[PDB]
Structure 1
Amino acid sequence: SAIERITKAAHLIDMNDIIREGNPTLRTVAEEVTFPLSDQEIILGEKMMQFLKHSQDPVMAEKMGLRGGVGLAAPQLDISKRIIAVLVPNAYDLEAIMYNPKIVSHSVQDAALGEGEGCLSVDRNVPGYVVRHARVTVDYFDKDGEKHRIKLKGYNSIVVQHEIDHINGIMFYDRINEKDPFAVKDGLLIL
């Protein structure tokens, strides 16, 4: 399985482990993890965070052939589990490996990155504002099964929502306004 080979001590996630649109796993709803986690589930979270760190290192990214990433979801590795990693630099505005993340509150206000979004699973540009909640309250469990409840805004909020979308089989272009991709709707904050 993908999880068995990715969690080998010697394995370094690279772009060859990341599946692309057309793979049905990106459109399936990922399964919750149970606690306690297996060793493989903990190692996977660590491997995903290591990939983000490699992806943000100019030297390692070029040597490994990586697209830069600030987040990653296990379904992008063909692993249909509710596991995400987020690494948003300021050192880091947000560094977390989240098990069973869930939005439990959201603002009426929407937000979208002014520069649109990309996706490591999408090998093409799709222009437009990806409309998301401006602010979210997120529950998740860490590797030890301890529960965390955090409040996010700005870029941090966008990144986590993008990853949660992946574990629900949703892609970023699902949220662009097709009729006018750069419409600034009432109540939409452009970051």
Structure 2
Amino acid sequence: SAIERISKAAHLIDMCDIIREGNPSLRTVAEEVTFPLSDQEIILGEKMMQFLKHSQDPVMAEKMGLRGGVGLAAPQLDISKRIIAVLVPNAYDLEAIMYNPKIVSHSVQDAALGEGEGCLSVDRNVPGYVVRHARVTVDYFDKDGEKHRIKLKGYNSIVVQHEIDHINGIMFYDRINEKDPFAVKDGLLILE
């Protein structure tokens, strides 16, 4: 069991735990977690966040051969559960382990990072503007089953949507304009 070996106290998540394109799991819709959470589900969220911090540490990332990341979703670890971790640097602009996250409202205005996007499960560069909602209101539960409702914009908004896409089986390039990858449509805000 992926969640079983990953949640072992001694286990450190690394690139070898992250599945890549082709693996059906990344295109499957993740199952919601029930409350109360099991100890493994709590530990998993903590392991995921630990990985993000390790991936953002020069020495640590080097040692473990880690790709820098600002977010991670359980499906990427071959665990089909609606659990995601986000860690956006400013200490941190956003630090959160989210259970059953859901977008409950979104702006009509769209947004896209001017540099495009990349994915830990994608070993290649896919240029283009990843079209997302500029702003989103997200509901999620923390490890204690406490509900949170937050509003995100700018970079944080993009990052959370990218991870939520993973628990719904969507990849970043699925939102890039096939015709013109760098086309600027009315209402699209380019971030940079």
TM-score, normalised via structure 2 length: 0.99
Deviations 1:119-171 (A, max 9, x none): 00000000000000000000000000000000000000000000000000000
Structure 2 equivalent of residue 40 of structure 1: 40
**Percent identity, aligned pairs only?**
98
Q: Give the CA deviation at 1:100.
A: 0.1
1:50 deviation in Å?
Answer: 0.2
In structure 2, the gaps of 5 or more residues are: none
Q: Helix, strand or coil for the counterpart of 2:69? A: coil
Q: Which whole-Å deviations, capped at 9, do the CAs of 1:1-51 have from their partners, x for residues lacking one?
A: 000000000000000000000000000000000000000000000000000
Query: What is the root-mean-square deviation in Å for CA atoms of aligned residues?
Result: 0.2
- Name the SS for the 2:158 alignment partner: helix
Count of aligned pairs between the two proteins: 191
Q: Give the 3-state SS of the residue equivalent to 2:137 in structure 1.
A: strand
- Give, in whole Å, the separation in 1 of the partners of 2:58 and 2:180: 35
Deviation of 1:106 after TM superposition, in Å, equals 0.1
Which digits, 9 at most, give the CA deviation of each residue in 1:40-75, with x for residues without a partner? Answer: 000000000000000000000011000000000000
- State the distance in 1 between where 2:189 and 2:17 align: 34
Question: 1:27 aligned to 2:27?
Answer: yes
**Structure 1 stretches of at least 4 aligned residues deviating more than 2 Å after TM superposition:** none
- SS at structure 2 position matched to 1:127: coil
**1:85-115 deviation per Cα after TM superposition (whole angstroms, max 9, x unaligned):** 0000101000000000000000000000000
* Structure 2 residue 109 is the aligned partner of structure 1 residue 109: yes
Match of 2:162 in 1: 162
CA positional deviation for 1:80? 0.1
Matched residues in 2 for 1:118 and 1:76: separation? 14
Partner Cα separation in structure 2 for residue 53 and residue 164 of structure 1: 20
Distance of 2:165 and 2:30 partners within structure 1: 10
Give the secondary-structure state (helix, strand or coil) at the position aligned to 1:60.
helix
Cα distance in 2, alignment partners of residues 145 and 110 from structure 1: 31
Equivalent position of 2:180 in the other structure: 180
Partner of 1:60: 60
Q: What secondary structure sits across from 1:122 in the alignment?
A: coil
Q: Partner residue of 2:129?
A: 129
Query: How far apart are the structure 2 equivalents of 1:48 and 1:187?
Result: 35
Find the counterpart in structure 2 of residue 151 from structure 1: 151
